[PDB]
Amino acid sequence: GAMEGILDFSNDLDIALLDQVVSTFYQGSGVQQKQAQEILTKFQDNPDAWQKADQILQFSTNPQSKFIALSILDKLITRKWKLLPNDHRIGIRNFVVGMIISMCQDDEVFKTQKNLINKSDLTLVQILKQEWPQNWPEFIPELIGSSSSSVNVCENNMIVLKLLSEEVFDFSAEQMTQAKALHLKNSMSKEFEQIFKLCFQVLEQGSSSSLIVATLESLLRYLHWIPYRYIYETNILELLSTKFMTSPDTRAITLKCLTEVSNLKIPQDNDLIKRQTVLFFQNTLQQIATSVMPVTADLKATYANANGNDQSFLQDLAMFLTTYLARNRALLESDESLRELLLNAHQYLIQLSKIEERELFKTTLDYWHNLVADLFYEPLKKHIYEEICSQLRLVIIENMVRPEEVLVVENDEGEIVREFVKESDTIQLYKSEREVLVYLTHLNVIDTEEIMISKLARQIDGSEWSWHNINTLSWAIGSISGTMSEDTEKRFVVTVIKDLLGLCEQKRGKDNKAVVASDIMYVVGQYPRFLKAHWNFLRTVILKLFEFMHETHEGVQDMACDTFIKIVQKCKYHFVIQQPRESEPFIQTIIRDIQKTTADLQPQQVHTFYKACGIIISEERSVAERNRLLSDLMQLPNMAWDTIVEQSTANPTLLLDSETVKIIANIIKTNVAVCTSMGADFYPQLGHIYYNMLQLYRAVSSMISAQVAAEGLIATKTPKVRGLRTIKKEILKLVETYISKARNLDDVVKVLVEPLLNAVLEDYMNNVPDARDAEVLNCMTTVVEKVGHMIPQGVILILQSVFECTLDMINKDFTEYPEHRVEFYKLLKVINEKSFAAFLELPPAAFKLFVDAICWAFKHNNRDVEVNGLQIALDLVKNIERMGNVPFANEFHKNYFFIFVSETFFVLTDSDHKSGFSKQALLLMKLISLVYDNKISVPLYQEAEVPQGTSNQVYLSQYLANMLSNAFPHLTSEQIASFLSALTKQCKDLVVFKGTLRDFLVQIKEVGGDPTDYLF
Amino acid sequence: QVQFKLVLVGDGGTGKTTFVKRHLTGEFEKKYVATLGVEVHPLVFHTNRGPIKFNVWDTAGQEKFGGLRDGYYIQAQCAIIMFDVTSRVTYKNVPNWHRDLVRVCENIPIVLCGNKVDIKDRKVKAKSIVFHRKKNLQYYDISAKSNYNFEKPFLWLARKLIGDPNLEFVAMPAAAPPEVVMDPALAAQYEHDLEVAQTTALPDEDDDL
Amino acid sequence: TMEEDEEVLYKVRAKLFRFDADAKEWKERGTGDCKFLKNKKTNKVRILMRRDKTLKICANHIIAPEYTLKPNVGSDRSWVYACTADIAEGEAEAFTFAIRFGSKENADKFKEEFEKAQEINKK
Ligand SMILES: Nc1nc2c(ncn2[C@@H]2O[C@H](COP(=O)(O)OP(=O)(O)OP(=O)(O)O)[C@@H](O)[C@H]2O)c(=O)[nH]1
Ligand SMILES: [Cl-]
Ligand SMILES: [Cl-]
């Protein structure tokens, strides 16, 4: 189109054509906007587009054209500035400075093109970052002088100082070398008194102008770093705390200024500075009460209405009070004349904590935690805040949010459904409220109980019954478990549950019953101490959980099984013994009616039920009773199991029935569930099924392969094959579960592993990729982890079966087979730690693929893969060095030392792997340290390339100097020399070594970096 | 109808394009195709105060693909800053995105969004996220995959852009749809694709729905 | 909303996909409640499905007598069919849809209601 013309630099640039491309891009739409987009991108990245920028700024009619012209300059200044001749350097400075002055002197331009002024100022500051003070010593004096001659210029100079402070103190850590940031910080520090005085004068001689706001905005930045004397030993605190609080458009920035003030570096042994810290607080609270709102005001509603800036202001007020009071409240708690100030400030926070906005509430709750922890440990303080804490309990109790245990939830329509997702943010909010509430109960357990019982009273008689109110109250009652005495707890709990049982029988409909059931279950689950001492109530609880397992509403039954587990892991002892006045241990009554009570549960609920039963049974430590309790629990699963394997091993084609495959899977899932809670104790049941289970694995394997061969790869997606692969994954998971928790490791080696490896390794290696289960890798990881030291040859066999063929699946992109990818490097990690000898038994060609496999893991951005990849590399280097001066280690270094050095350099420096920076550095440092401690006993170089007497230190720095020179051709030789020098001297100090590396990452993004930076 | 320019910024891979595409078409793109510069997308929501349109400027997070960078922010009326709760580094550069953003847009509503909260191994946990408190950003955990809180950024911006705190999304009315006849000249084209559709498996077959 | 002159014959939670024929992949269109609405004036039955939270329409078409529910190779709780005129997204379009449910029971229940609705639209 006509718009492509601006990318042809053969001609003069048509400014009108540019402005239209720009206009099309910003104000147009559709494919013209999209065509314009790519044209300006090509225009902007053209390496000589900066030469036009002078031209555009003069004659363009379009602000955003000029913005883009500056962006092009910006990228010139920040990256290739130092190669320009100085004719162009000073010229660019001159027309950037002149454009700023020219725009400030025209008042309608100053009013209307704020974006373009702001971008020019940022571009000036990028010029300052490379030229000032060494090639511009006059800048700050001239800036100060120019301020007095024009007010628009004065205001704009505050924006330039603000941005300069930001770039030097707030964002320099990542973007400059240590030595340059140190140089620019010292330069500002020496010139700040000239700057502070100009800022102080502006603030005294002016009220609420836009010049005032711009100055306060720059002061906020200076407060991050300036010496305390500029704030405490001038009058600036009084101005901030009174004059700039009354005017509403300086008020927001002042309040952020005083928040940063409530964080300075300040002596603690000076009572005048303490007086000033009190006074600016007293002045600010004074100005809020008379100019903004009184202590009594309903901030909940103010915040809800969202008039003007009320939301931002209430946020900034919350941040001010909690910052100031977390550090200085003790300055208020002794003097009786400041008691009113102290409590008025907290009263404002009480009103802030009523605002219905979660992030604001998290801000105040963190402060309340800070306060009530202090009142609980600090002597003689809690009485000061008695009334504050009493209202704080009400706030927390009425705004409890749902704990993780509660699975029923109100939706948008207003019915009670089971929760779809885990809400991790609200789970965390619940624990934060619990921790504050727990402290507040300890500070006055009578008040807390009174609030709660009288709230419960008003739920029974209905005068404020609601789903919200019964929930929040129930959750608060549950969260304070352990704060009461055993006697007060017993009266409290008996009351609360008897009443909650009352509500459940009273109310109509399955929604009201689902709500009250989830509340009952939350409470009971939180008080096992009470349940353990009162078998009467424990057993009614358990039986009541069994009733809830029969409810239509699936959310209620799920929570019953989880509450049953929660009670049983704390009360299991009381189920396993026979109580007074009963026939049997309750476990055998539970196992007895296990089919009836689980009748309307879905499969995974019943599997949870059996896991709870498993938790109980493992409390019994006599082997004979536990082995048979186990046998009785597994009777339904074993009964069904025996009929299935007698059918299948008789006729191997009866299994294809899809309802048989679900029967088989739920049988195995029941075993997995039970083995999860019993661990080592599971072993008798496992043996009862182990050999038949491995035969059903081989049988199911053949059918998977037969169906892929008959129907194609798509067969892996069908329900029938997915169901049979479920059977293999559940079999592997049961065995992985037992082996991870097993005590008797010789039984593992002598009985379990050889049948396992024969059943699964060949079947994995010889299936097509889309048929191999990543779960096999996972299962082998646990086998090597627990018993690897006892089975060297089995680890060899594992390597050979899975290693090359799985490497072939995952080594052509970073995407395919994502769970194979993760289980594979997990498996190589554990083999390399616990059975490194296995890698020694690999042929040289397979050891090369191993090394290839590691460096492949570095380049991932799936952090499960790369942390294991970098870990394996570090562990392999450790393994080679323990061997010492032997042929395999010396060969390894000659074949792989420089492959490892360059591969970690590549990922350190390519800006695509910055999350592994720390482990990359550690690996690189360990590699460099080997050479500098002479731990490599043969020459790394091939012979007749360097003289024979030369050390590996000498050749390493040539190798790296050459490798860096070609990869980073724009670095000078001195830059590379000084870097490697510093890098090798620092190769035992990880933190400095890492700073050298980050300094290098800065310099490769620019031209002309100073080599002396590496002596920092 | 009135429309507002929205800029969506954040590190590469955090899910900005996935989040936009989930709102445009309903889909969940699993692949990562880094965007180059910006791509502009109209997106309209129906409220009890009429329809609100966002021209969503979906910017590139990778530096090599950055395009015009802060040039995309000019005359933005609102913004979303995106990071990934499974990647600490993307929370570490949130102050860098916010820096570049507010130097160009001095006073606009801005949402901070930590995406991917559906992944079990969360690395930036909900206690560590506090950057929004002093910058007056609204913060939300979201998951473009599970759609957790996926409408709240837009509903918050709509409330502040219109200036009505009680603004709610409402059911757009559904016109009575037609009765069109099939034709045998274009059918054998559709019936090959109907066949291919039956033999192409549905994604995520172990999901609850 | 345009649903008060309409009876709801059947509602079920479901996830709906469209087949992108150039990419060769299924793509989600919406998750939410799928409703069979029967207009009280015409006795015509449409599918109307809205996304959760945004309430946006992701499916809006007559349950035409011609349509056939066919299984999808990878799923037992899904149906596939070619729709000739859907208006969820502006002007009418053709689509190959897939709709998947939480359960094999719901899928088979949908199938029977779906063809009950086809009988109604004939008459
Ligand atoms: N598990 C999970 N994955 C997600 C989620 N959101 C996005 N992803 C994936 O993360 C990747 C993000 O890709 P994009 O959405 O293109 O990322 P982007 O932020 O647009 O990247 P740039 O365009 O480079 O800036 C894609 O693979 C998504 O499938 C999520 O909520 N959960
Ligand atoms: Cl502009
Ligand atoms: Cl001073």
Ligand SMILES: [Cl-]
């Ligand atoms: Cl116990």
Ligand SMILES: [Cl-]
């Ligand atoms: Cl040099």
Ligand SMILES: [Mg+2]
């Ligand atoms: Mg993108």
Ligand SMILES: [Mg+2]
């Ligand atoms: Mg019609």
